[PDB]
Amino acid sequence: NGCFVDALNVVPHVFLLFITFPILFIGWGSTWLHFPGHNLRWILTFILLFVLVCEIAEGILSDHLHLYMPAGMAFMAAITSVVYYHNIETSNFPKLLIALLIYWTLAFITKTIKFVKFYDHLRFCLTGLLVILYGMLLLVEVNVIRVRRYIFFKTPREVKPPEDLQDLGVRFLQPFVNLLSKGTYWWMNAFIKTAHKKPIDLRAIGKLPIAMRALTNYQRLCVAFDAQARKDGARAIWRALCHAFGRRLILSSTFRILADLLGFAGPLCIFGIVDHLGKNAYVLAVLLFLALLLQRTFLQASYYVAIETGINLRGAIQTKIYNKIMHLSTSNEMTAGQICNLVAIDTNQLMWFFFLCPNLWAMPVQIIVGVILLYYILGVSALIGAAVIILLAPVQYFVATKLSQAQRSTLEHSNERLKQTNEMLRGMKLLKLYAWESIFCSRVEVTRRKEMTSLRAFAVYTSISIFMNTAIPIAAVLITFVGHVSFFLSPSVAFASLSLFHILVTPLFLLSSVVRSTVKALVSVQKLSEFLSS
Amino acid sequence: RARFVSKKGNCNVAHKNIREQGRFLQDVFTTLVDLKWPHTLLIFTMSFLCSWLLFAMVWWLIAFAHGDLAPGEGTNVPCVTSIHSFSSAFLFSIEVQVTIGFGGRMVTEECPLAILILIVQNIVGLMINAIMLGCIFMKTAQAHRRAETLIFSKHAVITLRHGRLCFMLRVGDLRKSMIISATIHMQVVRKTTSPEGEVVPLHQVDIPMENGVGGNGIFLVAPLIIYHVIDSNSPLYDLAPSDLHHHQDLEIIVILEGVVETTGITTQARTSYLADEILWGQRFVPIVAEEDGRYSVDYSKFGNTIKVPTPLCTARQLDEDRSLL
Amino acid sequence: RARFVSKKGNCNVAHKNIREQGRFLQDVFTTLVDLKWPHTLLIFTMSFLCSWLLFAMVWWLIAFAHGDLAPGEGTNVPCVTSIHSFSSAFLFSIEVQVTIGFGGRMVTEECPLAILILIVQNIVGLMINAIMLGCIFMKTAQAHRRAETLIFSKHAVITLRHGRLCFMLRVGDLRKSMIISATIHMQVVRKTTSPEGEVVPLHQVDIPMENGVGGNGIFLVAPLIIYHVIDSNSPLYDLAPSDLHHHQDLEIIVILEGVVETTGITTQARTSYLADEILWGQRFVPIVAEEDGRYSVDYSKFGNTIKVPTPLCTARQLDEDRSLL
Amino acid sequence: IPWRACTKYLSSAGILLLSLLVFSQLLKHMVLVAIDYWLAKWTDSDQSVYAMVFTLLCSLGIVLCLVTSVTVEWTGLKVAKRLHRSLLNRIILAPMRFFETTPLGSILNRFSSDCNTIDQHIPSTLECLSRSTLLCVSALTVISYVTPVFLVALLPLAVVCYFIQKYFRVASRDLQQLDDTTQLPLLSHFAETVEGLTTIRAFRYEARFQQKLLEYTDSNNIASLFLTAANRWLEVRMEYIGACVVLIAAATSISNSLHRELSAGLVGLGLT
Ligand SMILES: Nc1ncnc2c1ncn2[C@@H]1O[C@H](COP(=O)(O)OP(=O)(O)OP(O)(O)=S)[C@@H](O)[C@H]1O
Ligand SMILES: Nc1ncnc2c1ncn2[C@@H]1O[C@H](COP(=O)(O)OP(=O)(O)OP(O)(O)=S)[C@@H](O)[C@H]1O
């Protein structure tokens, strides 16, 4: 009785979609309360979305409406569960939660019946995954009733919605929104729309949450520094920062590596589609859509978490070196300029290096996966190509260094020019009282030519950089395809190689800047340690 | 500048940081009886269609499960005679739910499970019909529209009556139907600083309406100018006539309450007059006129105003001059 | 210690030895319209099922008695065509009662007794349907939930305003919908002994709410601190500031009444403040703030309080010092 | 900023190099698309002649790229030269009362930075903007040619981007300047503490000054944080649309170019 069990599955989705509509229509016609398992709930709901897409794929492969309707109904049921949970996060209730719990139990029952009747005789894996996900969501609901007040004894002892991010006027609410918007930044729609009309200012801007201030980051950093110095330096301050900023950085890094994996994965499903049509493809197309959106979302969340950790670190070490400025001795002009450079360039170097920290961990796995993937698509010839592109990464670095050198020289000349100007724009009446102005303008132009001369070499190096940027992509395909067929090709192979070439060219440039930033940050932290410990 | 309550009678102050404990939905039907008509009609049709589709699905399933859905001649009688597909099942659901009872498809005495589904279908249908009638009727006692028909003059003037400064404002009715026992609560708001150093952002204070021996309420047949006399005890008594037009921030609101005749509900109307809306030293034009055998009221001159040669000075200084004259 | 009425607004005093003369049930529907929703829904389904089963039994019996129940071909026509067993009879009862009218089983013009049973079945059905709709609608005018949405600050403070001792308490609204003509009845209770040797266990006395020229009522848009001034005539005027926090037993309750707009019913809210809840010499933080073009109200500071350097002394001794200063 | 500033900037270069830059860029992008267009016909299977044509296209691409880069370099340097000389000459012939009226900071500052800023960043950023816009136009034209119908589906979404553009800039500029402001009094404050350090440690005013510095660093962080939040917003939304377009392109390619079109060399270019 397969159709019978299909209908029995369709029923509970219908029940929930029908109870959701009155409440959703009343709610559709400023305190955020969060419950334990919220993030777990949303993660599991996205996994449900994915498995439901797979079930729809199965239903397309089989076709019999009644045989693939259960997926199309669970889709709206999960979306309506999301709508319910949004309506509960916005206003708490003990009853709406039970309304979810009933549906979870009934869906679990139907899935169990499906599993048994299948065991007695692709479907197997999908049904099992759905069973596991529904069970985990059930356990989450049981946790929620165990926490505060589903039925439990009389009073919830309810939390008292968090005043950190919800009390008196604050505008940057990142930690206090729905875990979907924590990814897609939906809370910025209101800000940006209001910003279009009225000019933004510090009165129109928010105030930083208690999760990120000078005091909070300074507290964590000084606690780590204390726990490290009680066990007694450059390595000490380093490990102190490391243990102080902890989980956020590694979380960003793992977001980043998973995104890198899915990005390396995209072109392979492209390849599969191209193969299938030349000789099971709609599924690959929708999977490509899903993988693209998920990969890019994870990449962006990674960027943001890293940036926020870096901003925390900048605030922390800034207020710390200001705290040190109070206890220093008078015997230690040049030190003042060194101090203000220690805040204007050294701290910015530290913070931008902390921006680029997860990229330094995620780059090697990216190039490794790239080379191993292209080898299995083009064979030995691939290896040759895989060399050429990689050879651009060290060369780039060299080029960059030359730029820096040039920059230094140019800056020198520029400074001198400014001096020869500051006089003329002060002795104005003196200058024009006898018209010696052209005589000084000749000298000013004499300086300018030297400045121009430096700029030629700088722009030549810039030109070489821009040239290599788009030359190596062409050269890779040239020396690879000519060196593969006519030396040693379905459209899929060539186009997958093209995609991988671009997906590998994009990260390669960043490794050079990462290396420069890392060495400069190491030097700047040695400097900060020498200063902070005088 | 910011206004307290708008001219139309709606409230301006936007609320922030409401610790919602859920009472906003806990008022389940006293919430939606507030709504507009399109939303309430939408949610009523959605209630009805939701219930109908739910039971149509369960009936489709029960006819499928008994096996009466499998087309076969003999050896059975369907629990519901003449049922073939989902469509006819949904037709049966709407046939029994909303109590039309077509009877082309007959539920039979062979299956007691169908008896149970019917005996719950009908009671839930009747309960949701009962609430969806009571709440729409509780709605049609929305008489705020009768709060719309009342009107006040756009700006209010002050004058000198009986040797004392006075302020005059108009009101009036717009239909034949009277409003029972209307009362006037006339209030003034101002950012005030106490002698104790306490500053309030807004300070409501009652200014009396001056009728016979006492009384808070009035009788509305024709447009009646409401007549208060500011005295040294009154809170408004201290201001100056040249500082009101531009700078000062003084909202004078009036709240007229009263129960309409036919529905019996108690409605009210609220309006504000700003420091830039009010003006000084004028007089309204007489509306009522002895016509052929009755009193004709002309609403064209309702907001009309004539100049009057009255002295212009502050009520404090005017009281000091009354002490001098 | 024992409280008079609880914070939630429910009454605490448990009644004992009520000479029940039966009026508790004599209010038959004004009793059950008070009940919760599950109990009222239970008793409504039980009313309906009771009536349906009663008439299904009587119909089963009448078809049995006529002999039309005895399956036979010819020499008769059943009073109700196509009736076989009790199940089909109960199906006929629910078919004619709740006015679906399936018509598979036809009541015929051969037996006038069946005509009588139908002509009483339908009228009793219609009457019990009429009451079971009117009472559920009379229920959906439960607006006590709107008595839930109102809020008062947890504790009340006293201050010195205009050179005289004052007590300040907050109130406020939680929805867009206004409350018409709300009035404040502010009462104090205390175990009192008269000079005649009479001791009362509890003694309610009105303490005035101090508005403009008079008036018992207020206007609620934004959170308005209610402002009373205790004077030598006031009953609360005699207490001491150090004896209130721990020992004395003084409940100050406030009862705010008002009719909600949309339903028109008159609701109220009641709250108590104990001698241990109230505190001395403080000031609330200003809620209302001039935002972009409006007034923003922040309910986070609703219950917030700041210290104020005010003299601490008894109102009697403070009045004596005012006589001295 | 209007087109007049850029018009004067490029007219200082002259008609000699303007077209030499623009047409060379157009031709480089045309070669970069045509190589893949010919590879599309290369795929299905004269393989040797095909590979030789591929080699010819690959050589044309790199030669043209080198030419374009050298053009941008030479033009930028000439423009900087002429602009500096003209600025100096025009400042020389000014009346004395003009020099006395205008503060020294503004007159000196333009030469100090404007000149430096332009020389350091205008050529590279201009080259990058040109390459980006032409690559985007080329990609749109490719996915249009590959799918006759996909074109008609992509013009709606692109119009969406227009609405995403305005709302971004009118804020992204604003926040930007705010950042600059919160950076200026902070650093200066630091310096004030260093010089008058003895006076501040004497008055025992260390607490209030530490409070002020926490205030300033918070005002800096809120700005530098909202800026990255807005950049993330624009990024994610533009990316969601860039994924919608590839979804629709692949969905049209699998059916149109296989079922009825019966062409496989198309879907490759479009998907890639
Ligand atoms: N314990 C009680 N509980 C509730 N109601 C009562 C109670 N006692 C009396 N009543 C009613 O309320 C009124 C109070 O009057 P009472 O105290 O009973 O004096 P009474 O003269 O004895 O009147 P009775 O008891 O009816 S003969 C009476 O009229 C009763 O009807
Ligand atoms: N921001 C708010 N919005 C709406 N209602 C509130 C808010 N804060 C409190 N309330 C309710 O109204 C009353 C005001 O008292 P409060 O200012 O909260 O003092 P409280 O002692 O902290 O009481 P709590 O918050 O319930 S422990 C409380 O009893 C709350 O139930």
Numbering used by the authors:
A (entry chain B): 24 to 52, 63 to 96, 103 to 160, 167 to 277, 283 to 329, 354 to 406, 411 to 566, 571 to 616
B (entry chain A), C (entry chain C): 32 to 356
D (entry chain B): 996 to 1040, 1060 to 1286
Paper text:
ATP-sensitive potassium channels (KATP) are ion channels that selectively allow potassium ions to permeate the cell. Specifically, they are inhibited by ATP and activated by Mg-ADP. Previous studies have established that the functional KATP channel is a hetero-octamer composed of four inward-rectifying potassium channel 6 (Kir6) subunits and four sulfonylurea receptor (SUR) regulatory subunits. KATP channels in pancreatic islets are composed of Kir6.2 channel subunits and SUR1 regulatory subunits.
The second structure is the KATP channel in complex with ATPγS alone, which is solved to 4.4 Å resolution (abbreviated, ATP state). Therefore, we applied ATPγS, a slowly hydrolyzable and functional ATP analog, to stabilize the structures of the KATP channel with and without GBM. The overall KATP channel structure and SUR1 conformation in the ATP + GBM state is almost identical to that in the ATP state based on our density maps. In the ATP and ATP + GBM state structures, SUR1 is in an inward-facing conformation. We observed ATP density only in the NBD1 degenerate site but not in the NBD2 consensus site, which suggests that the degenerate site has a higher affinity for Mg-free ATP, and ATP alone is not able to drive the dimerization of SUR1 NBDs. Here, we refer to class 1 structure as the “T state” (the tense state) and class 2 as the “R state” (the relaxed state). Instead, they possibly reflect the endogenous mobility of the CTDs in the Kir6.2-inhibited state, because we observed similar conformational heterogeneity of the KATP channel in the ATP state and the Mg-ADP state as described later.
